[PDB]
Design a protein around this ligand. Structure first.
Ligand code: ZN
Ligand code: ZN
Ligand code: ZN
Lengths: 89, 519
């Protein structure tokens, strides 16, 4: 051949157990509202309900994980302490 | 009227000296309080208003040219009379505002951010040197210059961005100032300049973006200055975002551990001729801003086999997580072949070059039909490979034109101008343009970041504090965020009333007498 690839320096991304099909807290979906929002428009003003990402790469609704901060907050999908590393999918 | 502000000060100082000598030698023992008071009130209190601002080398001109002795003698003379330092600092601040407006001017495109930050730092250092040499480190002058910097630096929203670009330019390679003393001094000056700066959120965001750019590219930039940078950040920012910075550094560490372990595993297996040299990296979504990790595009066959082997290993011995494929990161070394010169592709031209290897004489339709390519990145990569190329072209075309057509055939040129075997096409990371779409998207991202940060603060603080009636707790929440960014009263007022729709301190507006101190 005329051009042959010798080295490749790709970067791989990964997530723990985000479950796109279902919030592990609310069991609706990774998107499309939560159990305590229901109607998408209602009185939301651009739907403040977003997706919360922690240092443990686990994804839930920001509303879903905000209700669990009051009591024990141990990211119930693992033993890591839940943080807030990214907002929005 | 007979002189100017240059020689009048020496003459009045000599007059004061001779008057005090005469009064202490030719008159009674004390004899000086009313005499010196009235002499000052006549001379300085009358010359103060007009001799420093009118014209012909007053205070502004004698400071612009850099006359240290003039500044020192003016400071030592006007210090005796009250309200002298006040107007001195007022005129100095006016000159500082004029210089900043002449320097922070936004009208006109084509300015170098690194040069702008260097000029601002040089002006700050010059003013600090003048202060140290003449004003004897007076507190009033320092306060006035700090206020002036806070006032004129926040005119443009891109100032922290330019500071981040300057620090990235200084950190990428220490070609200027090989030794460490001048590097340390320049870093101290940079952090001092950043001390009198607001809007730390955009600064941190752009610094993290620069970290991602410099750590996901060719390594061995400094290998030691990262510790100095994080130490300075700890003593400047605190423990808000520095922890996440060291966390993504640990992510880089985990990535290199993954590279070596995957190399060992590929050596153990060695099935296909697609993993000759693999430099794969593993990062987390939360730390690095890789949320746009879904360019779904085809991969060349040897990279296809390498990615398949890596995915199988990661799904066999690293179960519990799945990988996502992307193209907008990394690089590669393409071995071309009269000598064998190795090219370089930043995972953008790999698919087009592989298609050319499979069959030459392609066009835009061929590279847009049978490859499943995105839109903007396609155009960017095509322009980088074809348009705006110096005399080292690796992908030539017959229809030589600036704009991109559809039916254009692509060819390849030898270009023996490369004197080594490792020639790279570094079309990316060009002159800092900061186009409107990227600026708008990063502004929206930082706005959402602030909007979630304020909510996090209000739910972390107010759970252990008292209640507000009309505007009591908003002052506290703005004071806690005074060192972060602007209070934005309308934004916080509109956002605090959005949580009433559900539980966890709904903060009922009608029943504002008491708030629900529950979870
Ligand atoms: Zn949920
Ligand atoms: Zn919700
Ligand atoms: Zn977790």
């Amino acid at each position: 051949k005329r051009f042959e690839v010798k080295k490749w320096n790709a970067v791989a991304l990964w997530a723990w157990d985000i479950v796109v099909d279902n919030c592990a807290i609310c069991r609706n979906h990774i998107m499309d509202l939560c159990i305590e929002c229901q109607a998408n428009q209602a009185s939301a003003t651009s739907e403040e309900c977003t997706v919360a990402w922690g240092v443990c790469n686990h994804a839930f609704h920001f509303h879903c994980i905000s209700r669990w901060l009051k009591t024990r907050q141990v990211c119930p999908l693992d033993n890591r302490e839940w943080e807030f590393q990214k907002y929005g999918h | 009227a007979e002189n100017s502000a240059s020689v009048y000060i020496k003459k009045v100082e000599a007059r004061i000296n001779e008057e005090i000598e005469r009064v202490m030698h030719c008159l009674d023992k004390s004899t000086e309080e009313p005499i010196v008071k009235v002499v000052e009130r006549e001379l300085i209190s009358k010359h103060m208003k007009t001799i420093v601002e009118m014209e012909n080398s007053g205070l502004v001109h004698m400071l612009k040219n850099g006359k240290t002795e003039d500044l020192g003698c003016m400071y030592k003379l006007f210090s005796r009379v009250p309200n002298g330092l006040k107007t001195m600092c007022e005129c100095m601040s006016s000159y500082l505002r004029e210089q900043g407006k002449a320097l922070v001017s936004e009208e006109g495109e084509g300015k170098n951010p690194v040069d702008y930050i260097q000029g601002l730092l040089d002006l700050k250092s010059r003013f600090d040197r003048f202060l140290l040499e003449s004003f004897n480190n007076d507190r009033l002058f320092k306060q006035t210059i700090a206020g002036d910097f806070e006032y004129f630096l926040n005119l443009n929203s891109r100032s922290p961005e330019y500071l981040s670009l300057f620090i990235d330019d200084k950190l990428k390679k220490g070609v200027k100032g090989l030794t460490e003393q001048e590097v340390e001094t320049i870093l101290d000056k940079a952090m001092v300049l950043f001390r009198f700066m607001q809007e730390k959120d955009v600064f941190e965001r752009y610094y993290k973006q620069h970290l991602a750019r410099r750590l996901l590219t060719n390594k061995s930039v400094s290998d030691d200055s990262e510790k100095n940078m994080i130490s300075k950040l700890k003593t400047e920012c605190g423990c808000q975002f520095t922890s996440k910075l060291e966390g993504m550094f640990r992510d880089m560490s985990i990535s290199n551990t993954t590279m070596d372990e995957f190399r060992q595993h590929l050596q153990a297996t060695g099935v296909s001729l697609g993993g000759v040299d693999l430099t794969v990296r593993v990062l987390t979504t939360g730390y690095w801003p890789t949320q746009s990790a879904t360019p779904k595009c085809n991969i060349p066959p040897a990279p296809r086999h390498a990615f398949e082997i890596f995915r199988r290993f990661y799904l066999a011995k690293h179960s519990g997580r799945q990988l996502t494929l992307q193209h907008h990161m990394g690089s590669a070394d393409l071995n071309a072949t009269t000598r064998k010169h190795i090219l370089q592709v930043s995972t953008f031209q790999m698919t087009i070059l592989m298609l050319f290897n499979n069959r030459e004489k392609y066009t835009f339709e061929e590279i847009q039909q049978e490859t499943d390519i995105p839109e903007r990145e396609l155009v960017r990569a095509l322009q980088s490979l074809a348009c705006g190329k110096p005399t080292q072209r690796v992908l030539t075309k017959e229809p030589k034109s600036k704009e991109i057509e559809n039916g254009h055939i692509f060819t390849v040129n030898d270009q023996f101008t490369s004197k080594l075997h490792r020639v790279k096409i570094q079309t990316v990371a060009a002159k800092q343009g900061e186009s409107d779409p990227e600026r708008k998207e990063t502004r929206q991202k930082v706005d959402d970041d602030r909007k979630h940060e304020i909510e996090a603060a209000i739910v972390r603080i107010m759970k252990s504090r008292k209640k507000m009636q009309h505007n009591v707790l908003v002052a506290e929440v703005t004071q806690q965020l005074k060192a972060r960014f602007l209070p934005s009263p309308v934004v916080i007022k509109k956002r605090i009333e959005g949580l009433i729709e559900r539980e966890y301190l709904a903060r009922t507006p009608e029943d504002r007498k008491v708030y629900t101190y529950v979870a």
